Short mmCIF file of C-alpha atoms in Angstrom, two decimals:
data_model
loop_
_atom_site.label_atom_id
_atom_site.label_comp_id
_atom_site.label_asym_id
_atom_site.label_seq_id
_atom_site.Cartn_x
_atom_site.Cartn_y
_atom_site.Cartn_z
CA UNK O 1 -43.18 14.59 -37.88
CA UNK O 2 -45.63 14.73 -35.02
CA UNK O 3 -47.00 10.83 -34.61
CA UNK O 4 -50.16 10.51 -34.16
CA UNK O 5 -51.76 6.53 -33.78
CA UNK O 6 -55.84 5.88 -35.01
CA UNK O 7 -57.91 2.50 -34.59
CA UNK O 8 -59.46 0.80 -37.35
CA UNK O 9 -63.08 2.19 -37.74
CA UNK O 10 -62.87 4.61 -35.07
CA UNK O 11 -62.42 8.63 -35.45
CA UNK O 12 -58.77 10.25 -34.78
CA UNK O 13 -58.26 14.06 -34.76
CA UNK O 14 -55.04 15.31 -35.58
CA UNK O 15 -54.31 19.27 -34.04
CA UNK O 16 -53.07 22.00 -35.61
CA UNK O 17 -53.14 25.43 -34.13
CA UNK O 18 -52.11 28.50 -35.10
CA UNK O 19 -49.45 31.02 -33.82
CA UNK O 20 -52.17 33.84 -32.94
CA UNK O 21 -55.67 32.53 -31.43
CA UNK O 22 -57.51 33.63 -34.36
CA UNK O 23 -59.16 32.46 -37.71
CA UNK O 24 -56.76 32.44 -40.71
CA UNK O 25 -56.41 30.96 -43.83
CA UNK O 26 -55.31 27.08 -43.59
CA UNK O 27 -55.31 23.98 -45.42
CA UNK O 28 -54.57 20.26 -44.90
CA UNK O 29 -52.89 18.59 -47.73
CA UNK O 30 -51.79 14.44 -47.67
CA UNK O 31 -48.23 13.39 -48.53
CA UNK O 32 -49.43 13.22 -52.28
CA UNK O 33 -50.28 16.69 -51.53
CA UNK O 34 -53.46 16.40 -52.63
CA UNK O 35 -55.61 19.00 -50.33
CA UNK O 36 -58.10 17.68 -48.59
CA UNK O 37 -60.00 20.74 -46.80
CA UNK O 38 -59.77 24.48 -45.49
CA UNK O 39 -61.49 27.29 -44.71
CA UNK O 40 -63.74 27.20 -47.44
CA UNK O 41 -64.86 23.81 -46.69
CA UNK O 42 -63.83 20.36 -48.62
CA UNK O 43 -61.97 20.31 -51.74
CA UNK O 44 -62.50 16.67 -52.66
CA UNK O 45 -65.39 17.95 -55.17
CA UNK O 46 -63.48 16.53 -58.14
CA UNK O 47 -64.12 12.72 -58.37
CA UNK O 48 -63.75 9.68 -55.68
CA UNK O 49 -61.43 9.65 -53.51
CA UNK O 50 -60.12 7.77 -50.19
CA UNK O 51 -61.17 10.31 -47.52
CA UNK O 52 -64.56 11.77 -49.56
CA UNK O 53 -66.99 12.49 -46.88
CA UNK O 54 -65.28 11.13 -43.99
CA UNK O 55 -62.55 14.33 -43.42
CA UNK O 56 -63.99 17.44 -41.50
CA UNK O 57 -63.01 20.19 -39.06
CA UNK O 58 -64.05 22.06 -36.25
CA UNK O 59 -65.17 25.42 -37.63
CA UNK O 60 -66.23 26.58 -34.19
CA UNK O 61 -62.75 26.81 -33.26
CA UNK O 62 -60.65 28.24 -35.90
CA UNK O 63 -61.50 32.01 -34.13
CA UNK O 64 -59.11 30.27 -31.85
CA UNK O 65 -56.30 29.39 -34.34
CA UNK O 66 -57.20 25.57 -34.13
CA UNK O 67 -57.68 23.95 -37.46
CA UNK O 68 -57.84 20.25 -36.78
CA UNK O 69 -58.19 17.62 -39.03
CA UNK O 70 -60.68 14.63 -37.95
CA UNK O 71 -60.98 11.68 -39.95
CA UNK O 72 -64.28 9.25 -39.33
CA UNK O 73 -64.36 5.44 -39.72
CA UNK O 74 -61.02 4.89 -40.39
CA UNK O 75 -59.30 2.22 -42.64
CA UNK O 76 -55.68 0.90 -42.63
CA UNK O 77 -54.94 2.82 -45.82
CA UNK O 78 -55.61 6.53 -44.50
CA UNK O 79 -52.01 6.00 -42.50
CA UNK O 80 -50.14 9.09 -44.01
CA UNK O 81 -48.65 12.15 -43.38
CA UNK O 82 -51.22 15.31 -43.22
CA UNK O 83 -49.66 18.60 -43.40
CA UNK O 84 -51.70 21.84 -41.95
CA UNK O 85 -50.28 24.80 -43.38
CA UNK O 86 -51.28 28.04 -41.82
CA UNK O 87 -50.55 31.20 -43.13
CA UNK O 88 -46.17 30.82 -43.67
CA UNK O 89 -45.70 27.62 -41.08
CA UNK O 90 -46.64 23.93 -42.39
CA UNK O 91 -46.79 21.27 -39.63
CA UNK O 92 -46.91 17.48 -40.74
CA UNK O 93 -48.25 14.71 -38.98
CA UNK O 94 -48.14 10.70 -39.57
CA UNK O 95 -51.30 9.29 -38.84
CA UNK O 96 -50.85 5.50 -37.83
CA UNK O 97 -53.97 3.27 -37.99
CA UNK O 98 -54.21 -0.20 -36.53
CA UNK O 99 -56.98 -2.95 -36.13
CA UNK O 100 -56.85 -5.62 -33.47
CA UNK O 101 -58.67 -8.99 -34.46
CA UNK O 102 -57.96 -12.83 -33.45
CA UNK O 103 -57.85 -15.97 -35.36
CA UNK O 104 -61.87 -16.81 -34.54
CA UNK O 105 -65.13 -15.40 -35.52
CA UNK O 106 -67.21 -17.27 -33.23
CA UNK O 107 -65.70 -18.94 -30.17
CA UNK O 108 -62.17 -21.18 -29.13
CA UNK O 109 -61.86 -24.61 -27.03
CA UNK O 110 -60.44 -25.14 -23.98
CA UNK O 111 -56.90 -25.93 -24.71
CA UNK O 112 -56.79 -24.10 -28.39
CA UNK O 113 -54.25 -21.70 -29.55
CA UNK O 114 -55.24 -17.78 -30.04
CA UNK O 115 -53.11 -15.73 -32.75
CA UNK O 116 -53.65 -11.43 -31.78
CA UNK O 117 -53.11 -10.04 -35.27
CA UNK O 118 -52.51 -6.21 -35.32
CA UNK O 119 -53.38 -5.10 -38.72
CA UNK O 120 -50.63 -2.50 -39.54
CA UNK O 121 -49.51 -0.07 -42.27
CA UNK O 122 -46.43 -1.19 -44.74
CA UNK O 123 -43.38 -0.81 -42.95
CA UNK O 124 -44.01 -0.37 -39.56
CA UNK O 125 -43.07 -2.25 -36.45
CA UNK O 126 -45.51 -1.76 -33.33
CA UNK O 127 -44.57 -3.14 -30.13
CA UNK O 128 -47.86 -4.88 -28.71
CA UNK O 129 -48.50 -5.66 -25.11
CA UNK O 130 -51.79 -8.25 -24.02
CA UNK O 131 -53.21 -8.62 -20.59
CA UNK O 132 -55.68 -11.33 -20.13
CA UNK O 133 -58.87 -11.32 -18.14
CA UNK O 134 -56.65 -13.49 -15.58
CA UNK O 135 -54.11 -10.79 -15.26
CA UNK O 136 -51.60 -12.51 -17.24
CA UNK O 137 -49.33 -9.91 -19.24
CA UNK O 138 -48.32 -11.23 -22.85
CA UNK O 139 -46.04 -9.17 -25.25
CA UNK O 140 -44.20 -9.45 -28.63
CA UNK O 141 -44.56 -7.95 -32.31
CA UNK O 142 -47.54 -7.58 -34.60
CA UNK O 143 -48.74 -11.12 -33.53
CA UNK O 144 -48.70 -12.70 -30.64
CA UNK O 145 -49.62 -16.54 -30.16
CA UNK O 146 -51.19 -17.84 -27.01
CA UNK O 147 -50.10 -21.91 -26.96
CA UNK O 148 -53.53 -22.61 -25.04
CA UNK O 149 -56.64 -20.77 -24.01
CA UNK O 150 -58.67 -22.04 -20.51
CA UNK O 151 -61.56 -21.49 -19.45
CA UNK O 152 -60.44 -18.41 -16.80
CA UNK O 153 -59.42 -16.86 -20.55
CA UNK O 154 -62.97 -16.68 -21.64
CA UNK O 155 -63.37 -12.69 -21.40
CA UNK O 156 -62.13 -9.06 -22.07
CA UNK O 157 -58.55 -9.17 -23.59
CA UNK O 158 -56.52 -5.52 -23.16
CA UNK O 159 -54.17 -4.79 -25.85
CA UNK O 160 -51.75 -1.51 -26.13
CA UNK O 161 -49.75 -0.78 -29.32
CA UNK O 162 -46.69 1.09 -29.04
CA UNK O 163 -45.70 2.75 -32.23
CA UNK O 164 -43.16 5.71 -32.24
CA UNK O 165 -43.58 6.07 -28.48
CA UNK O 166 -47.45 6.60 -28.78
CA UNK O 167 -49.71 4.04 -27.30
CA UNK O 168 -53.12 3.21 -28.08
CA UNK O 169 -55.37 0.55 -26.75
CA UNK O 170 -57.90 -2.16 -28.10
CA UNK O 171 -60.13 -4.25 -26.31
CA UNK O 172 -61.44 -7.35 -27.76
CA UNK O 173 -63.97 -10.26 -26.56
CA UNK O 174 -62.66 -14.07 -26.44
CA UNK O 175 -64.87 -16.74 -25.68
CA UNK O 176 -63.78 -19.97 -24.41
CA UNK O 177 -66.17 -22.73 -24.29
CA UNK O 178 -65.63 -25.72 -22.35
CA UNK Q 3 -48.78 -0.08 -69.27
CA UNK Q 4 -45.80 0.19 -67.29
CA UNK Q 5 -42.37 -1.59 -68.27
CA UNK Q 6 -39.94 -2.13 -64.91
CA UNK Q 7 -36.08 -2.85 -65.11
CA UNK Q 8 -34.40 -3.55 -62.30
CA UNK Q 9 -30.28 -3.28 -62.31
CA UNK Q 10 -27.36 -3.66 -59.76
CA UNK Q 11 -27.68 -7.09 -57.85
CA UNK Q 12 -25.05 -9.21 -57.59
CA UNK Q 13 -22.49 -10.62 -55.22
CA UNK Q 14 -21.65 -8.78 -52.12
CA UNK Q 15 -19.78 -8.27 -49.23
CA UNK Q 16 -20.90 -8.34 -45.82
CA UNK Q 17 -20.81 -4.65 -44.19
CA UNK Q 18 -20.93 -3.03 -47.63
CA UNK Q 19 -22.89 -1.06 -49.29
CA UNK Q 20 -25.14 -1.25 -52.92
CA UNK Q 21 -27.52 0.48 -55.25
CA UNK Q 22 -30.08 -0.76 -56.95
CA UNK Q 23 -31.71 1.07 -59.66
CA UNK Q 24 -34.96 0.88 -61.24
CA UNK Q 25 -35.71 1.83 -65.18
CA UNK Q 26 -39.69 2.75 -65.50
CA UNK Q 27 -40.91 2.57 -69.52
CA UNK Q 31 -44.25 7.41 -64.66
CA UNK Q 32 -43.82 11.12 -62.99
CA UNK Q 33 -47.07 10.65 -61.69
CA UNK Q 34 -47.22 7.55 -59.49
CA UNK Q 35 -45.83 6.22 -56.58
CA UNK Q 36 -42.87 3.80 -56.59
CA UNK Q 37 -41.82 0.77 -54.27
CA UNK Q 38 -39.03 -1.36 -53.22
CA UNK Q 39 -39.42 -5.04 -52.01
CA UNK Q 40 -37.77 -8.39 -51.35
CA UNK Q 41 -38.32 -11.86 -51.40
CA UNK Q 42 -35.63 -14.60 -49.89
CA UNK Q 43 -36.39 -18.32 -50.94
CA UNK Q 44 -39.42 -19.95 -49.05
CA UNK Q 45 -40.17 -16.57 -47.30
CA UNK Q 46 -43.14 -14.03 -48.06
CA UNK Q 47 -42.41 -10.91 -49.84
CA UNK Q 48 -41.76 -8.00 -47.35
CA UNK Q 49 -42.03 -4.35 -48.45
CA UNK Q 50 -38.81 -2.03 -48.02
CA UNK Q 51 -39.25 1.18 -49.29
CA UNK Q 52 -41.81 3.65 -51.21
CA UNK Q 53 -42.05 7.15 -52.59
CA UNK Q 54 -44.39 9.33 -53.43
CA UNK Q 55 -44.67 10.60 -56.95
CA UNK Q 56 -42.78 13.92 -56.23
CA UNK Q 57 -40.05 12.70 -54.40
CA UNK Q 58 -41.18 14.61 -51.46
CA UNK Q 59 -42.21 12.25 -48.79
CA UNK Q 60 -40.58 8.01 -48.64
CA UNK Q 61 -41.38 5.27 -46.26
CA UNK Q 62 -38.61 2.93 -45.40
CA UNK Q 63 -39.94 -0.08 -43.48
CA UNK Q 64 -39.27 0.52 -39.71
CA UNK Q 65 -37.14 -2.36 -38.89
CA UNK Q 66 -34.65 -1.20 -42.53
CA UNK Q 67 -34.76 3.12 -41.27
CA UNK Q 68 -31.46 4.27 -41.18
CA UNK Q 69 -29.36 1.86 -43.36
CA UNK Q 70 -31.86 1.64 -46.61
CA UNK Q 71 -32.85 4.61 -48.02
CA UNK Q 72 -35.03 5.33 -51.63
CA UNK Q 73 -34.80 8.18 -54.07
CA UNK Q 74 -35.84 9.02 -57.45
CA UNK Q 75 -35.45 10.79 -60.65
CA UNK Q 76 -38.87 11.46 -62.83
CA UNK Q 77 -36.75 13.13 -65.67
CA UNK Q 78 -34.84 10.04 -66.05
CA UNK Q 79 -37.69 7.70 -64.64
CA UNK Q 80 -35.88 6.07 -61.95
CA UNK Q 81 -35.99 5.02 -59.17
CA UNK Q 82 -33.22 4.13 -56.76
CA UNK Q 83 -32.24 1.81 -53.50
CA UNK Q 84 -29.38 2.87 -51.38
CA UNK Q 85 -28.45 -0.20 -49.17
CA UNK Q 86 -26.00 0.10 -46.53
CA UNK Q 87 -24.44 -2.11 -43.73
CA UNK Q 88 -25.29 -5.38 -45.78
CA UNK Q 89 -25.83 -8.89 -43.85
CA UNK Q 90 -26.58 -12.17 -44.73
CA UNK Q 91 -30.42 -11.26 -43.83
CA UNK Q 92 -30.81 -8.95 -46.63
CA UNK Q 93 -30.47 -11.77 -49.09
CA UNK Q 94 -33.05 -11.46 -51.29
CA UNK Q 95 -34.69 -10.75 -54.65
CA UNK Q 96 -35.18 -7.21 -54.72
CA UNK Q 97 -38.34 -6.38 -56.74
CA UNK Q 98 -39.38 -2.68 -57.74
CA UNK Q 99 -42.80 -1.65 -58.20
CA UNK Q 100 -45.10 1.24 -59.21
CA UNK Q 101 -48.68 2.85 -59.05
CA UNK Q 102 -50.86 2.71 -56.22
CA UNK Q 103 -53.51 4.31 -57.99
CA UNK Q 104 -53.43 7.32 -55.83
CA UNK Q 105 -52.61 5.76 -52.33
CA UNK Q 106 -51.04 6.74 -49.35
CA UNK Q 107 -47.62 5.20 -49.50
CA UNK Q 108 -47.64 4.93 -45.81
CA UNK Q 109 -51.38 3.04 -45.93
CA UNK Q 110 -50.91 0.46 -48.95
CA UNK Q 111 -48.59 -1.37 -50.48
CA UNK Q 112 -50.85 -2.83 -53.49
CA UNK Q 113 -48.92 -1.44 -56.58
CA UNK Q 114 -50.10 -2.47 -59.86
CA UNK Q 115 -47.05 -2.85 -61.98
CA UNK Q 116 -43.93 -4.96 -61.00
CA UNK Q 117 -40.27 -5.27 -61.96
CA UNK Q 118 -38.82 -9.10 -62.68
CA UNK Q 119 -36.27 -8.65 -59.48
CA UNK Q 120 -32.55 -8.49 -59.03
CA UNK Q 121 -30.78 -10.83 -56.80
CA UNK Q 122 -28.71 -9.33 -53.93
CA UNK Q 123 -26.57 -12.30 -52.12
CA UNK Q 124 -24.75 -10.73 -49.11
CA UNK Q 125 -21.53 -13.29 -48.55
CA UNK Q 126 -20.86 -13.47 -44.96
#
């Protein structure tokens, strides 16, 4: 499978495109293969379900054989594999959605510890890397733990997940009062 | 209501391999794999989807676990391989996500007592 890697509450689009540049019948279907939407619009008319109202395409360019899936506001859970079948060829692609938080709501000490938590789907094993607003370059698993902020910390944090040899990047705001 | 049976822990060797088996008491819902070792969280190992089509083995387990099952008989099955003293464990099998991704959750509603695997080194 193609890999494809989403943030938490952000929008990913995964591609498809066709052999001829063209409109032609597709679909997108989820592992459970449940389909989610085609040409004819979206089939999740029958009830709730996970991706109801938040799973659309780009009908201006399926003349072009393109049939992407995009998926709005995304959660944790709507990791999976997608398949786009077009006409006699099926592609599949895991989606891989993480979320970037730290252990504080509000603010951290000079001299406290900070936990990076990278919210991740069952199973899987990113690789994160952390640079700090001092330039300091911090790496390790799904969590990394600082032993103690300073004030020179107080800022912008960078994070990039790798995951299947795709990156993606967070950014995330640390205070540091003195 | 869902009944789970696990089968096929025991006392093992180091390098080998075992299968664990799973006895459900449905066709139509995914199915997990998990462990627990003493004083350690739970960590999830495998799933598959209802059909059999699609699995998830955790990342750090790909390519020496693998899952499989059989909705006629309503099994489910864990193929370990390459066993070390790490993999000690209860090994806990699980079922219905109520229509989940089995890459995106791993909150199954039904659970199996366990089966203890002890890998001697």
């Amino acid at each position: 499978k193609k890999v494809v890697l989403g943030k938490k509450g952000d929008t990913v689009e995964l591609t498809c495109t066709a052999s001829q540049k063209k409109s032609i019948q597709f679909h997108w279907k989820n592992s459970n293969q449940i389909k989610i939407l085609g040409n004819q619009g979206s089939f999740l008319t029958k009830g709730p379900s996970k991706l109801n109202d938040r799973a659309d395409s780009r009908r201006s360019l399926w003349d072009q054989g393109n049939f992407p899936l995009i998926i709005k506001n995304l959660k944790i859970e709507d990791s999976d594999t997608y398949i786009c079948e077009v006409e006699d060829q099926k592609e599949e692609v895991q989606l891989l959605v993480f979320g970037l938080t730290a252990n504080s709501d509000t603010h951290l000490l000079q001299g406290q510890s900070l936990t990076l938590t990278l919210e991740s789907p069952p199973g899987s094993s990113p690789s994160v890397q952390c640079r700090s607003p001092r330039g300091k370059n911090i790496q390790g698993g799904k969590t990394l733990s600082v032993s103690q902020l300073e004030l020179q910390d107080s800022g912008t944090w960078t994070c990039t997940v790798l995951q299947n040899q795709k990156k993606v990047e967070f950014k995330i705001d640390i205070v540091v009062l003195a | 209501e869902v009944q789970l049976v696990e089968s096929g822990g025991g006392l093992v060797q180091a390098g080998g391999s075992l299968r664990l088996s799973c006895a459900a008491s449905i066709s139509s819902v995914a199915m997990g794999w998990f462990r627990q070792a003493p004083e350690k969280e739970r960590e999830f190992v495998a799933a598959i989807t209802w059909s059999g089509d699609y699995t998830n083995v955790a990342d750090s387990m790909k390519g020496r676990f693998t899952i499989s099952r059989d909705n006629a008989r309503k099994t489910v099955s864990l193929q370990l391989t390459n066993l070390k003293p790490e993999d000690t464990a209860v090994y806990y099998c699980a079922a219905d996500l109520r229509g989940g991704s089995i890459y995106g959750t791993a909150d199954y509603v039904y659970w199996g007592q366990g089966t203890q695997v002890t890998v001697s080194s």
